[PDB]
């Protein structure tokens with residue numbers, strides 16, 4: 027599954043739901059490894075629409091637990107990320123992922 031651990035608090039009121047456009051900054055890391063990607067490298071925020079399965083399941087379930095303004099750590103098991111296959115060259119097989127996510131706004 028996905029574990030959500032808060033780093034810094036959001037508004038405690040505005041939590042995204044299916045069909046909303048969520049704007050975030052994030053860093054993605056392998057558990058027991060290093061960073062593999064971040065939004066903040068280019069500084070252009072990452073945008074996605076919740077509940078359209080355009081991001082991994084752990085994001086779908088974990089970002090839905092975040093409110094606007096919040097920064098949280100998401101720990102995502104392989105079955106909620108990229109499973110047995112991964113994405114060779116960036117995410118290995120059977121990888122647990124850790125993300126530092128900051129939910130900026132709904133757009």
Ligand SMILES: C=C[C@H]1CN(Cc2ccccn2)C(=O)[C@@H]2CCC[C@H]1N2S(=O)(=O)c1cc(Cl)cc(Cl)c1
Nearest residue numbers: 052053054062063072080081082085113116117123
């Ligand atoms: C590239 C940005 C996305 C990619 N996706 C969607 C997705 C789309 C197609 C293939 C793999 N993943 C995702 O679901 C998640 C979570 C949202 C932020 C980013 N990733 S990510 O795990 O950091 C990532 C980032 C990058 Cl550069 C490549 C991969 Cl294969 C995965």
